[PDB]
């Protein structure tokens, strides 16, 4: 009996996020900016990746859903909304000591690596 | 700078629990019945371990805290309260297909392996 099931990544990301914050660490998220649908300031991307501070003080309206991470943040003082499909989330760790986790591959994220509509009808 | 931090186990256990239940799987918890402070029906322990069904229908007043798992459950029709220190939680998986996780060792649980007071003052 083959059972269909959702990716584990969002649950692991929220687990480590909560653990990091409960221990007063500053949660840093490593993102694959080459993943389709990623919407971040390209000028801050290095080697195809971008590291984001997901602390409560560095983000606004933080959402860690099963399909994506979304929030407002300031870059050089300018507030902008970032949108990150879950497949682009590579790891999350504490800025203070690097403790965290690198998410294991999940084939579903290859299938979901598709460019969404960002323009209105 | 050495940073003190709490064990990750309870966060991982809750992550997998939620993932299992959100995917309609029946969560089974593997417990080390030899760990001090464990309070379970010894008659159901096999090779020093006991497997418990943590589904919403099989448990009552389920608590998955940072230090322990506690709930009421029926064995041969009799309701009894179980208490499981987090250090005794070995793994959690889906009864249906065995998907889940075996918790990694955390030295803190060796230090916490101490017999608590179960009798009143
Ligand atoms: Ca905030
Ligand atoms: Ca948006
Ligand atoms: Ca129940
Ligand atoms: Ca009790």
Report how far residue A87's alpha carbon sits from residue A67's, in angstroms, rounded to the nearest whole number. Answer: 8
Distance of alpha carbon A101 from alpha carbon A109, whole angstroms: 18
Give, as one character, the DSSP assignment of residue A84.
Answer: E
Whether the CB-CB separation of A10 and A64 falls below 8 Å is answered with yes
B116 is written with which tokens? 């608590």
Experimental method: X-ray
B2-121 maps to CATH 2.30.30.220: yes
Question: Tokens representing A4?
Answer: 């269909």
- Distance separating alpha carbons of residues B19 and A7, to the nearest angstrom: 9
Q: How far, in whole angstroms, is CA B53 from its chain's centroid?
A: 10
Q: Measure CA B11 to chain center.
A: 12
Give the list of residues 6+ apart from residue A103 with CB closer than 8 angstroms, or none.
A9, A12, A13, A89, A90, A91
Q: CA-CA-CA-CA torsion for A84, A68, A21, B102, nearest 10 degrees? A: -120
Cα of A86 vs centre of ligand 1, distance in Å, is 20
Residues 6+ apart with CB under 8 A from A90: A30, A31, A32, A49, A102, A103
Cβ proximity of B32 and B24 under 8 Å: no
Give the torsion through C-alpha atoms of A92, A7, A73, A91, to 10 deg.
20
Decide if A8 and B25 are in contact by the 8 Å CB cutoff. Answer: no
**A57 CA distance to ligand 1 centroid (A)?**
5
H-helix or E-strand spanning residue B64 = strand B60-64
Which contiguous run of DSSP H or E holds residue A22?
helix A9-22
Closest CA relative to residue B12, chosen from B94, B110, B99, B100: B100
Taking alpha carbons only, the member of A57, A8, B21, A56 closest to residue B29 is: B21
Answer whether A32's CB lies under 8 Å from A21's CB. no
Q: Would you say A92 and A16 are in contact if contact means Cβ atoms under 8 Å apart?
A: yes
In chain B, the largest separation of any two C-alpha atoms, in whole Å, equals 54
3-state secondary structure of A41: coil
Mutate to test the interface with B, among A2, A4, A5 (most CBs of B within 10 A): A5
Distance B72 CA to ligand 4 centre (A): 9
What is the spatial distance between Cα A16 and Cα A36, in angstroms, rounded to a whole number? 24
Burial of residue A27 (CB within 10 Å: 0-12, 13-18, 19+) is buried
Residue B85 neighbours by CB distance under 10 Å: 22
Give CA–CA dist B96/B28, Å, rounded: 10
Task: Please tell me the distance from the alpha carbon of residue A36 to that of residue A117, in angstroms, as a whole number.
Answer: 11
Two tokens at B111? Answer: 């230090």
């Amino acid at each position: 009996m083959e059972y269909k099931s959702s990716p584990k990544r969002p649950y692991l990301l929220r687990a480590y996020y909560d653990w990091l914050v409960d221990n007063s660490f500053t949660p840093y998220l490593v993102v694959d900016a080459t993943y389709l649908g990623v919407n971040v300031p390209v000028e801050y991307v290095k080697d195809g990746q971008i590291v984001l501070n997901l602390s409560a003080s560095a983000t606004g309206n933080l959402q860690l859903t099963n399909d994506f991470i979304q929030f407002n943040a300031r870059f050089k003082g300018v507030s902008r909304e970032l949108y990150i499909p879950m497949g682009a989330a590579l790891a999350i760790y504490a800025r203070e000591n690097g403790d965290g986790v690198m998410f294991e591959p999940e084939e579903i994220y290859d299938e979901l690596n598709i460019e969404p509509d960002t323009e209105q009808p």
